[PDB]
Amino acid sequence: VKRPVSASLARAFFYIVLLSILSTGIALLTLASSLRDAEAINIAGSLRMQSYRLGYDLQSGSPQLNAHRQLFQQALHSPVLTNLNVWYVPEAVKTRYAHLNANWLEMNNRLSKGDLPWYQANINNYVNQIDLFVLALQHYAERKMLLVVAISLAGGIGIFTLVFFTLRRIRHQVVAPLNQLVTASQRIEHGFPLDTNLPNELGLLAKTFNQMSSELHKL
Amino acid sequence: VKRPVSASLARAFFYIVLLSILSTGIALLTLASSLRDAEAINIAGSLRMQSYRLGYDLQSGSPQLNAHRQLFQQALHSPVLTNLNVWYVPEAVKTRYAHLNANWLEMNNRLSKGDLPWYQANINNYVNQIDLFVLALQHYAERKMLLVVAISLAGGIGIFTLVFFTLRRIRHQVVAPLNQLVTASQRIEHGQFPPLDTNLPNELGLLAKTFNQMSSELHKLY
């Protein structure tokens, strides 16, 4: 016994089941992690409208300006947006977010100084930076949906392939010999050739069979 | 015989393979049905900003007012938002969207007449309506995603349970009895002659029987 069927199949079943739970599980993780994407885009997007609302408050001399500045700070630091500071989120997203933070520091100050000229000069570029942040969240959302197809489809192909060759091996090193042992057996049960060369358990069974059978024919 | 060892080994692979087909299938129609949720929400949301920018344009007497009025119409009628008026999309979304169209008509009108007093009195409610439309889309996207997670996780565990049990049946009906046959076969090599389990509905049962007989008669004649 230099190659048991126990180890071979177990081995093959371990690697196949493994990557089936890896590919399948990673895909689910990725879907699950997308549950808060629509919220992040919504909140991230609202920062655009709020930025303009602030300029509108400023231009009108609205008493709401200070409250609205507070709301912007609040929404910019929403749980959903602060959560993006994780390893598995693209650095681009995290980078842009940091940039929105520094921009806001200045914008908030200029607003409090009632500096409308600065605002008029800078608002368009300010809001564009936010808009490119929201665009990056959008792309990141799409990326995840595509990765799930990739992982499922690619892992899938990888599984078919491993299963194709494992099934072919089993057809050849388990089933074929078994059929030979079954024929021989039924023929013996009426009144005395196999694969005794196999390096596995079936090779051995056919060796002993050949022995026990051959001696009977002689007797 | 009833369950060829082949069939038992094939079924365990069949369930794993089927998991992958379903897994890609589900991912594909998730993609087909939801790849643009994020664009929809981004654009839907952007209408909120554009409404305030227009106000901002109005108050400044900006020459960009008309160009920006056009952008809103254009953004309001993006393919992604127009392709929402469909059976699969909750009536909530579709209703709120229609509301937005009616509102934009008057709002566009008041902008061109340069009616700032009206803008000031109505903008906050105007933008709240858009905001609720965006919220409708958001919840619609989350429900779909949540549904897909639940179904996938259900189907995954459903199928992996069958694989688990098929894989257990193989350790009992196949691997274990092979180890018996291997031990019995080894003793015979040295003329040793208990009986093997013949209960199995597979080829190992059939072989156990003939193995049992040939060995029992040898011990008597020998």
mmCIF file of C-alpha atoms in Angstrom, chain A residues 66-213:
data_model
loop_
_atom_site.group_PDB
_atom_site.id
_atom_site.type_symbol
_atom_site.label_atom_id
_atom_site.label_comp_id
_atom_site.label_asym_id
_atom_site.label_seq_id
_atom_site.Cartn_x
_atom_site.Cartn_y
_atom_site.Cartn_z
ATOM 1 C CA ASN A 66 -24.492 77.909 12.330
ATOM 2 C CA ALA A 67 -26.937 75.033 12.794
ATOM 3 C CA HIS A 68 -26.289 73.863 9.246
ATOM 4 C CA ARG A 69 -22.559 73.986 9.775
ATOM 5 C CA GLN A 70 -23.063 71.746 12.780
ATOM 6 C CA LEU A 71 -25.176 69.303 10.744
ATOM 7 C CA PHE A 72 -22.448 69.141 8.099
ATOM 8 C CA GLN A 73 -19.814 68.280 10.676
ATOM 9 C CA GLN A 74 -22.211 65.663 12.045
ATOM 10 C CA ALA A 75 -22.895 64.034 8.630
ATOM 11 C CA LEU A 76 -19.293 64.175 7.496
ATOM 12 C CA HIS A 77 -18.481 62.071 10.558
ATOM 13 C CA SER A 78 -21.419 59.716 10.216
ATOM 14 C CA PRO A 79 -20.790 56.182 11.514
ATOM 15 C CA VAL A 80 -21.086 54.902 7.945
ATOM 16 C CA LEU A 81 -18.399 57.302 6.630
ATOM 17 C CA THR A 82 -15.988 56.946 9.543
ATOM 18 C CA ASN A 83 -16.285 53.164 9.043
ATOM 19 C CA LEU A 84 -14.500 53.470 5.678
ATOM 20 C CA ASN A 85 -11.173 53.726 7.558
ATOM 21 C CA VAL A 86 -10.553 49.970 7.308
ATOM 22 C CA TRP A 87 -7.875 47.885 5.560
ATOM 23 C CA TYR A 88 -10.220 46.382 2.947
ATOM 24 C CA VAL A 89 -11.477 49.757 1.705
ATOM 25 C CA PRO A 90 -9.433 51.230 -1.164
ATOM 26 C CA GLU A 91 -6.845 53.783 -0.044
ATOM 27 C CA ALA A 92 -8.259 56.189 -2.622
ATOM 28 C CA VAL A 93 -11.604 56.337 -0.787
ATOM 29 C CA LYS A 94 -9.874 56.867 2.550
ATOM 30 C CA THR A 95 -7.551 59.477 1.036
ATOM 31 C CA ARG A 96 -10.386 61.505 -0.492
ATOM 32 C CA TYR A 97 -12.284 61.341 2.787
ATOM 33 C CA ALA A 98 -9.296 62.833 4.641
ATOM 34 C CA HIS A 99 -9.202 65.566 1.993
ATOM 35 C CA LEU A 100 -12.895 66.362 2.580
ATOM 36 C CA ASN A 101 -12.085 66.719 6.249
ATOM 37 C CA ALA A 102 -9.291 69.271 5.746
ATOM 38 C CA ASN A 103 -11.357 71.174 3.168
ATOM 39 C CA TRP A 104 -14.259 71.384 5.602
ATOM 40 C CA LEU A 105 -12.002 72.846 8.321
ATOM 41 C CA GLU A 106 -11.241 75.796 6.061
ATOM 42 C CA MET A 107 -14.788 76.078 4.654
ATOM 43 C CA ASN A 108 -16.257 76.125 8.127
ATOM 44 C CA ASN A 109 -13.891 78.894 9.190
ATOM 45 C CA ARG A 110 -14.483 81.031 6.113
ATOM 46 C CA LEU A 111 -18.258 80.610 6.620
ATOM 47 C CA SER A 112 -17.975 81.830 10.232
ATOM 48 C CA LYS A 113 -15.888 84.782 9.005
ATOM 49 C CA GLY A 114 -18.771 85.474 6.611
ATOM 50 C CA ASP A 115 -16.306 85.394 3.704
ATOM 51 C CA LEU A 116 -18.669 85.228 0.709
ATOM 52 C CA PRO A 117 -15.970 86.185 -1.846
ATOM 53 C CA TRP A 118 -13.881 83.151 -0.853
ATOM 54 C CA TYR A 119 -16.922 80.956 -1.005
ATOM 55 C CA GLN A 120 -17.872 82.181 -4.488
ATOM 56 C CA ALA A 121 -14.303 81.531 -5.678
ATOM 57 C CA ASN A 122 -13.953 78.085 -4.035
ATOM 58 C CA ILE A 123 -17.320 76.403 -3.736
ATOM 59 C CA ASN A 124 -17.251 74.795 -7.153
ATOM 60 C CA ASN A 125 -13.947 73.046 -6.558
ATOM 61 C CA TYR A 126 -14.933 72.204 -2.963
ATOM 62 C CA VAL A 127 -18.099 70.421 -4.072
ATOM 63 C CA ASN A 128 -16.298 68.687 -6.907
ATOM 64 C CA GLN A 129 -13.915 67.062 -4.417
ATOM 65 C CA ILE A 130 -16.948 65.736 -2.524
ATOM 66 C CA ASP A 131 -18.496 64.616 -5.785
ATOM 67 C CA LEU A 132 -15.361 62.639 -6.687
ATOM 68 C CA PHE A 133 -15.514 61.037 -3.232
ATOM 69 C CA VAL A 134 -19.119 59.977 -3.902
ATOM 70 C CA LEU A 135 -18.066 58.730 -7.352
ATOM 71 C CA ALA A 136 -15.331 56.615 -5.726
ATOM 72 C CA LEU A 137 -17.845 55.146 -3.241
ATOM 73 C CA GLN A 138 -20.060 54.383 -6.236
ATOM 74 C CA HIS A 139 -17.228 52.593 -8.014
ATOM 75 C CA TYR A 140 -16.296 50.743 -4.842
ATOM 76 C CA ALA A 141 -19.918 49.603 -4.530
ATOM 77 C CA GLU A 142 -19.830 48.352 -8.125
ATOM 78 C CA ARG A 143 -16.436 46.734 -7.689
ATOM 79 C CA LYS A 144 -17.850 44.564 -4.903
ATOM 80 C CA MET A 145 -20.767 43.344 -6.962
ATOM 81 C CA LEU A 146 -18.318 42.404 -9.723
ATOM 82 C CA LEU A 147 -15.851 40.711 -7.392
ATOM 83 C CA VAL A 148 -18.664 38.461 -6.165
ATOM 84 C CA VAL A 149 -19.282 37.326 -9.745
ATOM 85 C CA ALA A 150 -15.558 36.953 -10.356
ATOM 86 C CA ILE A 151 -14.949 34.902 -7.203
ATOM 87 C CA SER A 152 -18.010 32.749 -7.688
ATOM 88 C CA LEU A 153 -17.370 32.178 -11.373
ATOM 89 C CA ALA A 154 -13.598 31.726 -11.099
ATOM 90 C CA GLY A 155 -13.704 29.583 -7.990
ATOM 91 C CA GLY A 156 -16.479 27.676 -9.738
ATOM 92 C CA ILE A 157 -14.338 26.919 -12.769
ATOM 93 C CA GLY A 158 -11.515 25.913 -10.432
ATOM 94 C CA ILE A 159 -13.922 23.557 -8.689
ATOM 95 C CA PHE A 160 -15.262 21.987 -11.906
ATOM 96 C CA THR A 161 -11.675 21.357 -12.976
ATOM 97 C CA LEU A 162 -10.579 19.699 -9.720
ATOM 98 C CA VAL A 163 -13.806 17.697 -9.696
ATOM 99 C CA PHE A 164 -13.337 16.648 -13.318
ATOM 100 C CA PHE A 165 -9.923 15.149 -12.623
ATOM 101 C CA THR A 166 -10.867 13.661 -9.256
ATOM 102 C CA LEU A 167 -13.859 11.954 -10.855
ATOM 103 C CA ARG A 168 -11.672 10.635 -13.673
ATOM 104 C CA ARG A 169 -9.174 9.242 -11.154
ATOM 105 C CA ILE A 170 -12.012 7.563 -9.219
ATOM 106 C CA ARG A 171 -13.455 6.076 -12.423
ATOM 107 C CA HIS A 172 -10.015 4.570 -13.113
ATOM 108 C CA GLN A 173 -8.557 3.601 -9.754
ATOM 109 C CA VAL A 174 -11.665 2.716 -7.759
ATOM 110 C CA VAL A 175 -14.669 1.969 -9.936
ATOM 111 C CA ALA A 176 -12.998 0.043 -12.769
ATOM 112 C CA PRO A 177 -11.165 -2.339 -10.431
ATOM 113 C CA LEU A 178 -14.294 -2.746 -8.274
ATOM 114 C CA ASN A 179 -16.304 -3.808 -11.312
ATOM 115 C CA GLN A 180 -13.597 -6.390 -12.064
ATOM 116 C CA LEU A 181 -13.766 -7.655 -8.480
ATOM 117 C CA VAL A 182 -17.567 -7.857 -8.731
ATOM 118 C CA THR A 183 -17.614 -9.802 -11.992
ATOM 119 C CA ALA A 184 -14.926 -12.192 -10.702
ATOM 120 C CA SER A 185 -16.924 -12.609 -7.496
ATOM 121 C CA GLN A 186 -20.231 -13.496 -9.146
ATOM 122 C CA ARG A 187 -18.470 -15.860 -11.539
ATOM 123 C CA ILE A 188 -16.776 -17.609 -8.596
ATOM 124 C CA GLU A 189 -20.187 -18.051 -6.948
ATOM 125 C CA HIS A 190 -21.011 -20.314 -9.924
ATOM 126 C CA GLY A 191 -17.692 -22.117 -10.471
ATOM 127 C CA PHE A 192 -12.202 -19.871 -10.780
ATOM 128 C CA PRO A 193 -8.451 -11.568 -14.114
ATOM 129 C CA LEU A 194 -7.924 -8.545 -11.904
ATOM 130 C CA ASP A 195 -5.774 -5.506 -11.284
ATOM 131 C CA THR A 196 -3.333 -6.629 -8.599
ATOM 132 C CA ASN A 197 -0.781 -3.974 -9.624
ATOM 133 C CA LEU A 198 -2.692 -0.958 -8.237
ATOM 134 C CA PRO A 199 -0.828 0.704 -5.330
ATOM 135 C CA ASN A 200 -4.060 1.115 -3.320
ATOM 136 C CA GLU A 201 -6.533 -0.912 -1.212
ATOM 137 C CA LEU A 202 -8.232 -2.398 -4.271
ATOM 138 C CA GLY A 203 -4.902 -3.682 -5.583
ATOM 139 C CA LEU A 204 -4.553 -5.591 -2.317
ATOM 140 C CA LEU A 205 -8.093 -7.004 -2.363
ATOM 141 C CA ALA A 206 -7.472 -8.388 -5.858
ATOM 142 C CA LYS A 207 -4.163 -9.959 -4.770
ATOM 143 C CA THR A 208 -5.817 -11.842 -1.906
ATOM 144 C CA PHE A 209 -8.809 -12.652 -4.080
ATOM 145 C CA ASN A 210 -6.533 -14.088 -6.804
ATOM 146 C CA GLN A 211 -4.825 -16.183 -4.130
ATOM 147 C CA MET A 212 -7.930 -17.524 -2.359
ATOM 148 C CA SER A 213 -9.616 -18.178 -5.706
#
